[PDB]
C-alpha cells in the first residue's frame, strides 16, 4: 500500500482513461468510460470522464491513496471534467500538469489529421 501517488488522465475525443499510480508511476488502479457501462460515442463525454475519474479515485483511495499529482494528456472533452472530479473525490490533488505528447513536426499523420 501507498499514500501519495500520481493520477494520469489520458483523454481523447473518444474516451477518458484514468489510471492512478504510485510515486514511481507504477499503476495502483485504473478506470475509464468503459469501466462504467458506456460503450461507443458515450465513452467520450464529460460525464463519462467524471464517473471514470470518480471510479479511479474511489478505487485508489480504497488503497490508502491520499495525495495525487494530476498529469493530463490529450484534448478530449472529458479532460476538464476529470480534473474537477479528482478534486471533488477526496484526494489531496497536489498538482496538475499537462504532458500532452506534441511532436516537433515528426511522423506524418493519418489523412484524418493532416
Amino acid at each position: 500500500q501507498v499514500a501519495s501517488g500520481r493520477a494520469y488522465i489520458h483523454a481523447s475525443y473518444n474516451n477518458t482513461i484514468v489510471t492512478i499510480t504510485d510515486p514511481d508511476g507504477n499503476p495502483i488502479t485504473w478506470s475509464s468510460g468503459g469501466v462504467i457501462g458506456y460503450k461507443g460515442s458515450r465513452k467520450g463525454t464529460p460525464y463519462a470522464a467524471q464517473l471514470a475519474a470518480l471510479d479511479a479515485a474511489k478505487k485508489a483511495m480504497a488503497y490508502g491513496m491520499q495525495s495525487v499529482d494530476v498529469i493530463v494528456r490529450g484534448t478530449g472533452a472529458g479532460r476538464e471534467q476529470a480534473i474537477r472530479a479528482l478534486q471533488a473525490s477526496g484526494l489531496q490533488v497536489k498538482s496538475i500538469v499537462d504532458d500532452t505528447p506534441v511532436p516537433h513536426n515528426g511522423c506524418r499523420p493519418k489523412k484524418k489529421f493532416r
Binding site: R42, T45, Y47, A48
Partner: protein, 155 residues
C-alpha cells in the same frame, strides 16, 4: 413563439377553495367546454377524499400534484445531425402542467366506473406516491438520469 414569449394566462381562482391550481386542474378534466360537469367531478371527488381517509382534500390534492411534478425530463437537441435525449430540468410552469396533465390522464386509466372515483382514487394514490401519474413522473425522471451523459448538450 417567434417574436416574444407567451404570456402565461392567469386563471380565476375557483369559487370553493379559491385556488388557481384547482382551476387549471378542472380545466384539465374539462372536455368540449362542459366545465360544470368537470366542476362536479372534481368536487364530488373532493367529497370522497374527505370520506376515505378523512383529510382536508385541498391538502391531499396538493400532495398528489407535488408528488407528480417532474424535476427533470429528456428533450431532443441537434448538434451536427443528432436527436439526443438531453436531460433538462423542468420549468416550474411546465412542472405543474405535466402533473395536472398526467393526473387526469392516469386517473382516466383507472378501472372504477364513475369519474370522480377515478379522480379521487388517483389523487389519493398520488398524494402517497403511488399510482399511474407517479409511475409516469418517476419514469420520466429515470430516463433523464440515464442520459446524464448527454447533459453537456444542455443549453
Amino acid at each position: 413563439a417567434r417574436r416574444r414569449r407567451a404570456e402565461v394566462r392567469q386563471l380565476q381562482p375557483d369559487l370553493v377553495y379559491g385556488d388557481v391550481l384547482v382551476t387549471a386542474f378542472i380545466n384539465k378534466i374539462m372536455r368540449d367546454g362542459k366545465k360544470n360537469l368537470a366542476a362536479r367531478i372534481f368536487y364530488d371527488a373532493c367529497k370522497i377524499i374527505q370520506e376515505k381517509t378523512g383529510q382536508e382534500p385541498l391538502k391531499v390534492f396538493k400532495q398528489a400534484v407535488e408528488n407528480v411534478k417532474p424535476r427533470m425530463e429528456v428533450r431532443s437537441r441537434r448538434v451536427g445531425g443528432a436527436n439526443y435525449q438531453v436531460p433538462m430540468e423542468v420549468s416550474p410552469r411546465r412542472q405543474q402542467s405535466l402533473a395536472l396533465r398526467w393526473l387526469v390522464q392516469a386517473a382516466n386509466q383507472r378501472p372504477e366506473r364513475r369519474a370522480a372515483v377515478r379522480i379521487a382514487h388517483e389523487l389519493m394514490d398520488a398524494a402517497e406516491g403511488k399510482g399511474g401519474a407517479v409511475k409516469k413522473k418517476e419514469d420520466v425522471e429515470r430516463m433523464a438520469e440515464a442520459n446524464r451523459a448527454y447533459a453537456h448538450y444542455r443549453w
